[PDB]
């Protein structure tokens with residue numbers, strides 16, 4: 001029984017244009033075991049309507065999941081992805097960098 | 101023909117204690133999900149209007165029943181023979197099974213199993229092949245599993261007769277969505293600066309279908325070797341996302357362009373230049 005930390009990628013479906021509707025995504029991959037808690041944050045507080053794919057795994061048996069939501073980006077509105085897994089001591093927060 | 105050429109069902113069985121076991125399943129066509137599984141009701145959730153393929157509502161209910169009794173019986177016997185196999189709680193078993201079409205007409209079927217994220221068993225032409233990663237446990241399992249003819253026969257029917265009969269049904273029924281060609285959209289940005297006098301050149305590609313795509317950083321007609329390609333990340337609208345980066349010096353950034361080749365573009369490639 002091994003333990004692998006999830007790789008966390010935060011990205012928008014379309015390029016960030018302030019005021020226009022878009023989709024925010026958080027893709028968690030490469031983890032083992034499956035048991036995981038993921039949240040999408042808006043300035044530090046969790047978003048309510050967030051859909052997620054059913055559990056899946058890649059060839060090497062590591063698990064992957066996609067968490068998304070239809071958002072509207074503005075100037076100072078900071079977004080992030082909070083992740084809780086057995087490998088993490090405290091929840092890991094990875095910010096959304098528009099230019100990345 | 102383009103798009104997905106394979107069908108597979110997956111299984112993730114989390115065993116917490118001697119009498120607590122949850123199972124999660126789903127049907128896929130490559131990386132695209134077409135089936136979901138409602139564990140409580142023991143029925144399939146059909147994510148697309150063509151998810152049934154060419155199968156009848158009787159043929160699909162027969163299959164729902166097979167998986168339902170399997171999910172129960174699998175969990176039941178693993179909880180029964182856990183101490184016999186020296187298993188330490190908590191543990192997770194994983195399993196992928198299905199078939200695929202090759203160019204020429206041939207359909208190869210597969211079934212792979214796992215324990216603790218490591219290979220346990222495999223199925224190469226009607227027989228259990230224990231993986232060395234499973235050790236003595238895997239051998240002890242394959243040697244036991246062959247004695248139950250009733251379950252070995254129903255795996256053989258499913259894998260070598262029902263699976264290909266299914267694959268063609270869905271590949272055909274879903275021709276409209278599966279062999280669709282959605283055009284990519286591209287944009288540039290300057291990522292986090294690696295060196296104090298350097299610059300991270302980022303090329304973004306998104307909104308495309310099918311999966312095969314070519315993206316490189318160019319200098320006219322000469323491609324850069326230091327072009328680090330990102331992972332092919334998904335979007336829930338059955339489209340993809342790809343990043344292509346280049347670590348470069350300040351003055352060298354000018355003259356550089358990103359090139360995107362995709363099957364929906366039809367020769368008309370997307371070339372985007374860096375503006376000084």
Ligand SMILES: CCCCCCCCCCCCCCCCCC(=O)N[C@@H](CO[C@@H]1O[C@H](CO)[C@@H](O)[C@H](O)[C@H]1O)[C@@H](O)CCCCCCCCCCCCCCCC
Nearest residue numbers: 169170173174197198226227228250251254258259263266
């Ligand atoms: C559209 C779908 C296409 C996709 C096809 C690909 C998917 C393939 C799925 C395979 C699983 C699919 C595994 C097979 C499904 C299990 C159901 C079954 O045939 N078993 C009956 C056995 O008795 C059954 O009773 C029924 C009712 O009286 C009769 O109708 C059946 O003919 C009779 O076999 C009972 O034993 C209840 C089941 C409990 C047994 C636990 C099985 C766990 C171990 C199986 C591990 C498999 C690996 C072994 C290696 C083989 C070489």
Ligand SMILES: CCCCCCCCCCCCCCCCCCCCCC
Nearest residue numbers: 109110111125126127135144195197213
């Ligand atoms: C068209 C029919 C609709 C049904 C599809 C719904 C998805 C079913 C989910 C169940 C998946 C179970 C099969 C997995 C393969 C066997 C794994 C082997 C276990 C290894 C033992 C150590």
Ligand SMILES: CCCCCCCCCCCC
Nearest residue numbers: 173177178181182185241248
């Ligand atoms: C790893 C735990 C061993 C599981 C043993 C499977 C036995 C199958 C019995 C089928 C009932 C008829």
